[PDB]
């Protein structure tokens, strides 16, 4: 059959029974850094079972009048196990990911979701002179959420969360140029993405630079008749792939 899968990494296993295919990045699978492209000249560390496993973030509730959520990707796993400890003691590091968003409902519910994974999502402030604060651009394993109305400009430091512009000043229907899948509750149950390492330098610092962003926004809202179960959650699991670090120093 085609609708069944199984993903095994480390000591974790993910099984699905209703699914589409796997979207693989820009056509490329993640892999370690070659000896032609490296610049740091001391040996990296590769734990390879301790960090490359499935980490489950916090669930959120899909209400009827909801707008969307986002996560910043090398920041959500900053306090998750031995991935979060290697990010502190090391100065560099490159990583690819495997993202598996899962949301199930019955044959009597309706809905649709768009699961994109955008690189370099620089977001805009609400006041036109300033830039947003760090605690409102991201959060450890917590979803920052869009709004169906426009943030008032008299606020001091906020992110503009008008959903139809996606926070970056762009038409939100044009977001399908990035690698993406749809969760359609008529036919689908989950969405899987495999993303390689996309950056303009071969290695980068992992605390000052968030180089991926996962956006989940409902194009067709959730609806059901009275008598069905009203609580529908969404759960995101992210597993690093081929991670390696360099330049050991103090904790921070």
């Amino acid at each position, epitope marked *: 059959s085609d609708r069944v899968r199984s993903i095994t990494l480390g000591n974790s296993t993910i099984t699905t029974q209703e699914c589409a295919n796997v979207v693989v990045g820009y056509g490329v699978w993640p892999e370690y850094l070659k000896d032609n492209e490296a610049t740091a000249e001391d040996q990296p560390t590769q734990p390879d079972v301790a960090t490359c496993r499935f980490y489950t973030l*916090e*669930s*959120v*509730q899909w*209400m*009827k009048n909801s707008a969307g959520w986002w996560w910043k990707l090398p920041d959500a796993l900053s306090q998750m196990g031995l991935f979060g400890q290697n990010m502190q003691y090391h100065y560099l590091g490159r990583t690819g990911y495997t993202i598996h968003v899962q949301c199930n409902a019955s044959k009597f519910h309706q809905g649709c979701l768009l699961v994109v994974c955008v690189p370099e999502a620089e977001m805009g402030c609400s006041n036109l002179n300033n830039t947003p*604060e760090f*605690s*409102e651009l991201s*959060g450890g394993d*917590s979803a920052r*959420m869009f*709004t169906d109305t426009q943030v*008032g400009e*008299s*606020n*001091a*430091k*906020k992110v503009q969360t008008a959903v139809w512009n996606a926070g970056m000043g762009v038409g939100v229907g044009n977001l399908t140029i990035f690698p993406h899948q749809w969760i359609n509750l008529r036919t689908n149950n989950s969405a899987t993405l495999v993303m390689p390492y996309i950056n303009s330098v071969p290695m980068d610092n992992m605390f000052r630079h968030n180089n991926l962003t996962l956006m989940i926004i409902p194009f067709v809202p959730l609806n059901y008749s*009275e008598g069905s*179960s*009203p*609580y529908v*959650p969404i759960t995101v699991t992210i597993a690093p792939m081929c991670a390696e670090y360099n330049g050991l120093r103090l904790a921070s």
Partner: antibody, heavy 123, light 106 residues
Framework: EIQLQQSGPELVKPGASVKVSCKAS????????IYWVKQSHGKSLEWIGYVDPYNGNTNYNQKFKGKATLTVDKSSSTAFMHLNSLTSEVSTVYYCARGGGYYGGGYYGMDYWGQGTSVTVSS | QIVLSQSPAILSASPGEKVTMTCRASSSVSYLHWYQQKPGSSPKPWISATSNLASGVPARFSGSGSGTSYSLTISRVEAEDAATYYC?????????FGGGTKLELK
């Protein structure tokens, strides 16, 4: 509009019981939880518990575990709360609020409160 | 168990200045909301999930902070907010409340 409407204030005797109400109208009743808090005449707020109207799973505080019981009636979209063993320190007011589903979906918080019934304990 | 240590006990300010009111928790919480109760009325939902201003709230109110330290800040004190302000958490620990700092005009 979304409106939550409660009953009128009563008085009871020590050792008695009283059932308060919170009628919800203006929206679909089984979609959201209903939280119950109390406000003392001089102190801050305290949480009693909540109830899910879809299946009736009641959760409670550790202080009010045996002295309060919440129930629901889906056919009329009202919520009830039964208070056991009324005491001396409960010259307070009881509120009902509409929530989201408790930490899966509390991002709007407790977004629609009621008027509040004030009960007294006297002879 | 989460205890919300809302500080100070009481605040006072002349009309037309900037005030700051803080709340610190025992650990990290998922959400944080603030309410306003005028004495003799039900508490109204003010600023929710640490930043978002509610419906009908004037734009002179602000809230920020993360980690374990939160705050609420009125930019210019107008005359129609002589009330008390409570603070609520929504973590996996059951529920808590702040303690109600009172704001009256000097």
């Amino acid at each position: 509009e979304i409106q939550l409407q409660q009953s009128g204030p009563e008085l009871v005797k020590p050792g008695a019981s009283v059932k308060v109400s919170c009628k919800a109208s203006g929206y679909s009743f089984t979609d959201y939880n209903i939280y119950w808090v109390k406000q003392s005449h001089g102190k801050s707020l305290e949480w009693i518990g909540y109830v899910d109207p879809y299946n009736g799973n009641t959760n409670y505080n550790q202080k009010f575990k045996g002295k309060a019981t919440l129930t629901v009636d889906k056919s009329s979209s009202t919520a009830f709360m039964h208070l056991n063993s009324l005491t001396s320190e409960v010259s307070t007011v009881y509120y009902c609020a509409r929530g989201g589903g408790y930490y899966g979906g509390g991002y709007y918080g407790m977004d629609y409160w009621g008027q509040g019934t004030s009960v007294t304990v006297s002879s | 168990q989460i205890v919300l240590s809302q500080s100070p006990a009481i605040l006072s300010a002349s009309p037309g200045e900037k005030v700051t009111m803080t709340c610190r928790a025992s650990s990290s919480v998922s959400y944080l909301h603030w309410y306003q109760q005028k004495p003799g009325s039900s508490p109204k939902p003010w600023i929710s999930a640490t930043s978002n201003l509610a419906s009908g709230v004037p734009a002179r109110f602000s809230g920020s902070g993360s980690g374990t330290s939160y705050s609420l800040t009125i930019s210019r004190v107008e005359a129609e907010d002589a009330a008390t302000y409570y603070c609520q958490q929504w973590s996996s620990n059951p529920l808590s409340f702040g303690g109600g700092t009172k704001l009256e005009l000097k």
